[PDB]
Amino acid sequence: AQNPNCNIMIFHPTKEEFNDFDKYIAYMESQGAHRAGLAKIIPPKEWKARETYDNISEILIATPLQQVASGRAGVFTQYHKKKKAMTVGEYRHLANSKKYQTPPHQNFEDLERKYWKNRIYNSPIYGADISGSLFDENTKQWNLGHLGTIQDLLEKECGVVIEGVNTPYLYFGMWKTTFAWHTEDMDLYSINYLHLGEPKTWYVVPPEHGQRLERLARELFPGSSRGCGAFLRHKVALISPTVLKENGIPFNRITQEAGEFMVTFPYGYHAGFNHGFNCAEAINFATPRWIDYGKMASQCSCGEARVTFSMDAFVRILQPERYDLWKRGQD
Ligand SMILES: O=C(O)CNC(=O)C(=O)O
Ligand SMILES: [Mg+2]
Ligand code: NI
Ligand SMILES: [Zn+2]
């Protein structure tokens, strides 16, 4: 069995290997990359996402989200308070202000220590989940707006044509902005490109160990667990690496820098934080290997998770027994 320790693997495809996206995902899986839940892909040196980032300041962040924490430094939840709209140029100025800027630090490990010590005492503002793309239309390789759609994959594998669309999302971050422990909708893959700015630190649990994380989360967030049998779908809970290690949960960590892709694999729980002002683009995708994970994905039906239009068909076709309850939670 390849990669039996479930380490995060880093790949360096050549320009020739960068042509066929599906083929390269299958290659990484042949080497056991999915066992980690997360992989890094460094693009060939010849490649670029677009010519420059000099003209992005007028993008609008319609609903910036202030991420307010509750709990203790290593075990906390966050809620999102909506703020007034602002442009990317306004948000970048805010991120660089004395109130929000990255503190002085020695290295990524020092900054990580400072994040876990101090995150809860601040409320950073995240420009998340903005429909759009920063890839040039002329970029033919690993262009996250030009991927095969998940609806087309389901149709190819299973023979059933479904409604829905699959487009990318932009994320504008600042120091301490945080992504809570989660798997993707329907336990899909994700791909994330860090277009510019400061790094993103990731934590990940191997897919084969995801239920260990879920059992710890039920213990640590006992009211939330009574409220919902899949409350990690709410995307609000944080658990630090120190707490994971104290409780014997297998995990790994890695820092993504500008110009690098990350792929999350089906049922790979992940969480993390941004180092400073940055912009990322991410989208969900599927492969044949995903179908069995889609069929078994948990679902929130309490009303909290609320998701896109396109998830309806995935539930309806892959999980018909669950459909009626889940749809009630959507309405
Ligand atoms: O970058 C972020 O805030 C969150 N991204 C992801 O969870 C992802 O790409 O799957
Ligand atoms: Mg602009
Ligand atoms: Ni994700
Ligand atoms: Zn729920």
Short mmCIF file of C-alpha atoms and ligand atoms in Angstrom, two decimals:
data_model
loop_
_atom_site.label_atom_id
_atom_site.label_comp_id
_atom_site.label_asym_id
_atom_site.label_seq_id
_atom_site.Cartn_x
_atom_site.Cartn_y
_atom_site.Cartn_z
CA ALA A 1 0.00 0.00 0.00
CA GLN A 2 1.49 3.37 -0.99
CA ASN A 3 1.96 6.11 1.67
CA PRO A 4 0.83 3.92 4.61
CA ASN A 5 1.73 6.60 7.21
CA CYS A 6 -0.67 9.05 5.39
CA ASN A 7 1.92 11.80 4.98
CA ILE A 8 1.14 14.93 3.00
CA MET A 9 2.86 14.53 -0.39
CA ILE A 10 4.28 17.35 -2.51
CA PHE A 11 4.32 17.07 -6.32
CA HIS A 12 6.36 18.87 -8.96
CA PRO A 13 4.70 18.09 -12.36
CA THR A 14 6.53 18.99 -15.54
CA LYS A 15 4.82 21.18 -18.10
CA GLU A 16 3.90 18.08 -20.07
CA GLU A 17 2.42 16.39 -17.01
CA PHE A 18 0.41 19.61 -16.28
CA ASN A 19 -1.73 19.23 -19.42
CA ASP A 20 -4.15 16.60 -18.37
CA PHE A 21 -5.71 17.41 -14.96
CA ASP A 22 -7.66 14.20 -14.44
CA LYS A 23 -4.67 12.07 -15.35
CA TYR A 24 -2.42 13.84 -12.86
CA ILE A 25 -4.95 13.44 -9.98
CA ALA A 26 -5.07 9.74 -10.76
CA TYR A 27 -1.23 9.65 -10.79
CA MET A 28 -1.04 11.30 -7.36
CA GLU A 29 -3.51 8.73 -6.02
CA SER A 30 -1.39 5.89 -7.55
CA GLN A 31 1.38 7.16 -5.26
CA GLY A 32 -0.94 7.18 -2.17
CA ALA A 33 -1.43 10.95 -1.94
CA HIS A 34 -5.08 10.70 -0.99
CA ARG A 35 -4.28 8.76 2.14
CA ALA A 36 -3.18 12.07 3.77
CA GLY A 37 -6.40 13.91 2.87
CA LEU A 38 -4.34 16.78 1.36
CA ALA A 39 -1.57 17.18 -1.27
CA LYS A 40 0.50 20.12 -2.48
CA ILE A 41 1.13 20.67 -6.20
CA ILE A 42 3.91 23.13 -7.22
CA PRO A 43 3.24 24.20 -10.88
CA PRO A 44 6.05 23.96 -13.45
CA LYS A 45 8.20 27.05 -13.71
CA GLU A 46 6.86 27.85 -17.19
CA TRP A 47 3.27 28.22 -15.89
CA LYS A 48 1.36 31.25 -14.70
CA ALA A 49 -2.23 31.84 -13.59
CA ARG A 50 -2.42 35.31 -15.14
CA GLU A 51 0.06 38.10 -16.15
CA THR A 52 -0.27 40.35 -13.08
CA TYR A 53 -2.41 41.06 -10.01
CA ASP A 54 -2.14 44.84 -10.46
CA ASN A 55 -5.74 45.43 -11.46
CA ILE A 56 -7.83 43.53 -8.78
CA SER A 57 -8.58 46.37 -6.33
CA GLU A 58 -12.04 47.09 -7.65
CA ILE A 59 -13.43 43.59 -7.05
CA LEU A 60 -16.27 43.92 -4.47
CA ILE A 61 -16.53 41.95 -1.27
CA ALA A 62 -20.31 42.39 -0.82
CA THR A 63 -20.49 40.75 2.60
CA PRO A 64 -17.23 40.70 4.54
CA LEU A 65 -17.47 38.36 7.52
CA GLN A 66 -16.07 39.22 11.02
CA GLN A 67 -15.13 35.93 12.65
CA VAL A 68 -15.98 36.14 16.36
CA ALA A 69 -14.72 33.30 18.61
CA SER A 70 -16.16 31.70 21.80
CA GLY A 71 -14.47 29.06 24.00
CA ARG A 72 -10.90 28.46 24.97
CA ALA A 73 -7.72 29.05 22.98
CA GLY A 74 -7.46 25.47 21.68
CA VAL A 75 -11.16 24.56 21.54
CA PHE A 76 -13.50 27.24 20.19
CA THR A 77 -16.31 28.04 17.82
CA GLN A 78 -16.61 31.04 15.55
CA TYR A 79 -19.65 32.89 14.20
CA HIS A 80 -19.72 35.13 11.25
CA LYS A 81 -20.96 38.69 11.72
CA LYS A 82 -21.83 40.39 8.44
CA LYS A 83 -20.10 43.76 7.75
CA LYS A 84 -20.71 46.46 5.18
CA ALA A 85 -19.41 45.96 1.62
CA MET A 86 -15.96 46.94 0.66
CA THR A 87 -13.62 46.71 -2.33
CA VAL A 88 -10.51 44.48 -2.40
CA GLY A 89 -8.40 47.69 -2.25
CA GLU A 90 -10.27 48.81 0.87
CA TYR A 91 -9.96 45.32 2.42
CA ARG A 92 -6.20 45.15 1.69
CA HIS A 93 -5.72 48.50 3.50
CA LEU A 94 -7.72 47.17 6.43
CA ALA A 95 -5.70 43.93 6.57
CA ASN A 96 -2.44 46.02 6.69
CA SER A 97 -3.71 48.34 9.48
CA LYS A 98 -2.18 48.24 12.92
CA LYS A 99 -5.36 46.57 14.33
CA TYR A 100 -5.28 43.62 11.85
CA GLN A 101 -1.74 43.21 10.49
CA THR A 102 0.48 40.17 10.98
CA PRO A 103 2.74 40.63 14.10
CA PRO A 104 6.47 40.38 13.96
CA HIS A 105 7.57 36.77 13.92
CA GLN A 106 10.63 34.58 13.37
CA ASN A 107 9.33 31.90 11.06
CA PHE A 108 6.11 29.99 10.22
CA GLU A 109 6.36 27.93 13.41
CA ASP A 110 6.56 31.04 15.62
CA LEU A 111 3.53 32.51 13.80
CA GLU A 112 1.62 29.25 14.27
CA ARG A 113 2.33 29.41 18.03
CA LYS A 114 1.05 33.01 18.12
CA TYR A 115 -2.11 32.02 16.17
CA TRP A 116 -3.10 29.32 18.61
CA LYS A 117 -2.23 31.37 21.67
CA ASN A 118 -4.06 34.50 20.62
CA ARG A 119 -6.66 33.85 17.92
CA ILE A 120 -9.68 33.92 20.21
CA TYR A 121 -8.90 37.43 21.47
CA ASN A 122 -9.32 39.00 18.08
CA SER A 123 -12.04 39.08 15.41
CA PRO A 124 -10.46 39.15 11.89
CA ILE A 125 -12.56 39.96 8.82
CA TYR A 126 -12.67 37.37 5.94
CA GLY A 127 -13.85 38.03 2.31
CA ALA A 128 -15.05 34.48 1.67
CA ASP A 129 -17.05 32.64 -0.78
CA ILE A 130 -17.13 35.29 -3.59
CA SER A 131 -18.24 33.75 -6.93
CA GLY A 132 -15.61 34.50 -9.58
CA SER A 133 -12.11 33.69 -10.97
CA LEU A 134 -8.69 35.28 -11.32
CA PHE A 135 -7.37 32.81 -13.92
CA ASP A 136 -6.75 34.35 -17.34
CA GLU A 137 -8.99 32.80 -19.94
CA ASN A 138 -5.91 32.00 -21.93
CA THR A 139 -4.42 29.81 -19.14
CA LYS A 140 -5.13 26.31 -20.38
CA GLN A 141 -3.56 24.17 -17.66
CA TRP A 142 -5.07 23.90 -14.13
CA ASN A 143 -7.47 26.74 -14.74
CA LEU A 144 -10.03 26.32 -11.91
CA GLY A 145 -12.78 27.94 -14.02
CA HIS A 146 -12.32 25.35 -16.84
CA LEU A 147 -12.49 22.09 -15.02
CA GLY A 148 -14.87 19.19 -15.91
CA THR A 149 -18.06 19.71 -13.92
CA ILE A 150 -19.29 17.45 -11.13
CA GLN A 151 -22.64 17.14 -12.94
CA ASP A 152 -20.87 15.82 -16.01
CA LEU A 153 -18.86 13.36 -13.88
CA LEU A 154 -22.03 11.99 -12.25
CA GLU A 155 -23.58 11.67 -15.67
CA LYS A 156 -20.57 9.89 -17.12
CA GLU A 157 -20.36 7.44 -14.17
CA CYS A 158 -23.98 6.77 -13.44
CA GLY A 159 -25.84 7.68 -16.67
CA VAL A 160 -28.24 10.23 -15.23
CA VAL A 161 -28.32 13.81 -16.45
CA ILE A 162 -28.85 16.38 -13.69
CA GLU A 163 -29.36 20.13 -13.29
CA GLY A 164 -26.72 22.32 -11.58
CA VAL A 165 -23.58 24.18 -12.15
CA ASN A 166 -20.04 24.17 -10.60
CA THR A 167 -18.12 27.54 -10.49
CA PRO A 168 -15.10 28.78 -8.48
CA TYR A 169 -14.95 30.99 -5.46
CA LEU A 170 -12.52 33.69 -4.33
CA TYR A 171 -11.29 34.17 -0.75
CA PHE A 172 -9.64 37.35 0.45
CA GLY A 173 -7.92 36.74 3.83
CA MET A 174 -6.03 38.56 6.57
CA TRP A 175 -4.01 37.54 9.62
CA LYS A 176 -5.96 35.10 11.81
CA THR A 177 -8.79 34.49 9.35
CA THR A 178 -9.79 30.94 9.98
CA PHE A 179 -11.37 27.98 8.21
CA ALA A 180 -13.07 25.59 10.60
CA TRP A 181 -12.77 21.77 10.61
CA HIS A 182 -14.79 20.32 7.71
CA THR A 183 -15.00 18.00 4.78
CA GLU A 184 -16.39 19.24 1.48
CA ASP A 185 -20.08 19.17 0.54
CA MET A 186 -20.97 15.57 -0.34
CA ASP A 187 -17.34 14.64 0.63
CA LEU A 188 -16.14 16.02 -2.76
CA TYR A 189 -12.56 16.91 -3.59
CA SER A 190 -11.46 20.54 -3.45
CA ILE A 191 -8.64 22.36 -5.20
CA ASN A 192 -7.29 25.68 -3.88
CA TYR A 193 -4.82 28.02 -5.61
CA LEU A 194 -3.13 30.75 -3.57
CA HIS A 195 -2.98 33.60 -6.13
CA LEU A 196 -1.12 36.16 -4.11
CA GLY A 197 0.00 37.39 -0.74
CA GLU A 198 0.81 35.76 2.55
CA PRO A 199 0.66 32.02 3.31
CA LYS A 200 -2.15 29.71 4.43
CA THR A 201 -1.43 27.00 7.07
CA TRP A 202 -3.47 23.76 6.74
CA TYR A 203 -4.24 20.91 9.14
CA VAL A 204 -5.70 17.63 7.85
CA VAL A 205 -6.93 14.25 9.16
CA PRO A 206 -6.41 11.17 6.94
CA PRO A 207 -9.78 10.01 5.43
CA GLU A 208 -9.36 6.59 7.03
CA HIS A 209 -9.34 8.32 10.46
CA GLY A 210 -12.06 10.90 10.00
CA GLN A 211 -14.46 9.24 12.42
CA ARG A 212 -11.78 9.72 15.20
CA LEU A 213 -11.99 13.44 14.67
CA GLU A 214 -15.81 13.31 14.67
CA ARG A 215 -15.87 11.43 18.00
CA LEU A 216 -13.54 13.99 19.60
CA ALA A 217 -15.62 16.84 18.26
CA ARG A 218 -18.79 15.35 19.82
CA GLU A 219 -16.96 15.23 23.15
CA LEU A 220 -15.60 18.76 22.91
CA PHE A 221 -18.76 20.44 21.62
CA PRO A 222 -21.43 18.51 23.46
CA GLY A 223 -24.38 20.95 23.02
CA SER A 224 -23.69 21.23 19.29
CA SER A 225 -23.55 17.45 19.00
CA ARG A 226 -27.01 17.07 20.59
CA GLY A 227 -28.35 19.68 18.20
CA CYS A 228 -27.15 17.89 15.03
CA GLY A 229 -25.73 14.47 14.13
CA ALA A 230 -23.37 16.13 11.54
CA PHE A 231 -22.60 19.45 13.15
CA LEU A 232 -19.14 19.75 11.57
CA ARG A 233 -21.13 20.53 8.38
CA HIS A 234 -21.85 23.87 10.06
CA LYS A 235 -18.22 24.83 9.62
CA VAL A 236 -17.79 26.60 12.97
CA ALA A 237 -15.57 24.38 15.20
CA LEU A 238 -11.85 24.70 15.80
CA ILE A 239 -9.53 22.31 17.63
CA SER A 240 -5.82 23.05 17.93
CA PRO A 241 -2.94 20.73 17.05
CA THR A 242 -1.99 20.51 20.71
CA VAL A 243 -5.49 19.29 21.64
CA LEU A 244 -5.50 16.83 18.73
CA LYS A 245 -2.11 15.41 19.90
CA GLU A 246 -3.37 15.16 23.53
CA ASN A 247 -6.30 13.10 22.30
CA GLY A 248 -4.33 10.85 19.96
CA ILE A 249 -5.97 12.07 16.72
CA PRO A 250 -3.85 11.40 13.64
CA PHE A 251 -3.19 14.58 11.61
CA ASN A 252 -0.66 16.47 9.53
CA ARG A 253 0.12 20.11 8.82
CA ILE A 254 1.62 22.09 5.94
CA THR A 255 1.93 25.71 4.86
CA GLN A 256 0.85 26.78 1.35
CA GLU A 257 2.58 29.75 -0.29
CA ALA A 258 1.57 31.98 -3.14
CA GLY A 259 1.74 30.18 -6.49
CA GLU A 260 0.97 26.75 -5.03
CA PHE A 261 -2.09 24.46 -5.36
CA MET A 262 -3.56 22.30 -2.62
CA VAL A 263 -5.94 19.40 -3.28
CA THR A 264 -8.19 18.00 -0.57
CA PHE A 265 -9.41 14.45 -1.06
CA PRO A 266 -12.86 12.93 -0.32
CA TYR A 267 -13.60 12.80 3.42
CA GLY A 268 -10.27 14.57 4.30
CA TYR A 269 -11.14 16.83 7.24
CA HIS A 270 -9.22 20.08 7.10
CA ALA A 271 -8.88 23.44 8.95
CA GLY A 272 -6.44 26.32 8.88
CA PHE A 273 -5.61 29.99 8.98
CA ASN A 274 -4.15 32.81 6.89
CA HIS A 275 -0.86 34.54 7.76
CA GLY A 276 -1.75 37.97 6.40
CA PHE A 277 -3.45 39.61 3.41
CA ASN A 278 -3.95 37.03 0.63
CA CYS A 279 -6.24 35.87 -2.14
CA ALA A 280 -7.13 32.24 -2.89
CA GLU A 281 -9.44 30.58 -5.45
CA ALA A 282 -11.06 27.22 -4.84
CA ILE A 283 -13.62 24.88 -6.36
CA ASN A 284 -15.02 21.40 -5.76
CA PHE A 285 -14.50 18.57 -8.25
CA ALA A 286 -15.18 14.85 -8.57
CA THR A 287 -13.53 11.75 -10.06
CA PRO A 288 -14.80 8.19 -10.42
CA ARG A 289 -13.34 7.32 -7.02
CA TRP A 290 -15.49 9.99 -5.36
CA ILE A 291 -18.82 8.31 -6.16
CA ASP A 292 -18.63 5.86 -3.27
CA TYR A 293 -17.80 8.69 -0.85
CA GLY A 294 -20.71 10.75 -2.13
CA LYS A 295 -23.08 7.85 -1.46
CA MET A 296 -21.92 7.59 2.16
CA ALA A 297 -21.50 11.30 3.04
CA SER A 298 -23.15 12.51 6.23
CA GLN A 299 -25.60 15.10 6.08
CA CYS A 300 -26.88 17.99 8.29
CA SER A 301 -30.67 18.18 8.25
CA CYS A 302 -31.10 20.61 11.29
CA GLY A 303 -31.16 23.66 9.11
CA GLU A 304 -27.82 25.15 9.92
CA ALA A 305 -25.65 23.98 7.01
CA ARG A 306 -27.62 25.57 4.09
CA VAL A 307 -25.79 25.00 0.75
CA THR A 308 -25.91 25.60 -2.94
CA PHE A 309 -28.54 24.75 -5.44
CA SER A 310 -26.41 22.04 -7.03
CA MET A 311 -26.26 19.82 -3.96
CA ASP A 312 -29.91 18.89 -4.37
CA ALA A 313 -29.31 16.56 -7.26
CA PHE A 314 -26.34 14.90 -5.57
CA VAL A 315 -28.48 13.98 -2.53
CA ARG A 316 -31.48 13.07 -4.64
CA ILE A 317 -29.57 10.62 -6.87
CA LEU A 318 -26.86 9.29 -4.54
CA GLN A 319 -28.80 9.29 -1.25
CA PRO A 320 -32.52 8.88 -2.04
CA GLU A 321 -33.39 7.52 1.45
CA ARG A 322 -31.93 10.71 3.06
CA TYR A 323 -33.37 13.13 0.50
CA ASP A 324 -36.72 14.06 2.08
CA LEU A 325 -35.19 14.83 5.51
CA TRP A 326 -32.25 16.73 4.10
CA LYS A 327 -34.49 18.85 1.81
CA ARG A 328 -36.68 19.82 4.81
CA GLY A 329 -33.43 21.18 6.40
CA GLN A 330 -32.88 23.21 3.25
CA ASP A 331 -36.46 24.72 3.61
O1 LIG B 1 -9.14 28.83 2.02
C1 LIG B 1 -10.15 28.70 2.77
O2 LIG B 1 -10.61 29.59 3.60
C2 LIG B 1 -10.94 27.45 2.83
N1 LIG B 1 -10.63 26.53 1.72
C3 LIG B 1 -10.98 25.27 1.72
O3 LIG B 1 -11.60 24.68 2.70
C4 LIG B 1 -10.75 24.47 0.49
O4 LIG B 1 -10.11 24.92 -0.46
O5 LIG B 1 -11.29 23.32 0.55
MG MG B 2 -10.48 45.37 -10.04
NI NI B 3 -12.50 22.94 2.24
ZN ZN B 4 -26.92 20.62 11.43
#
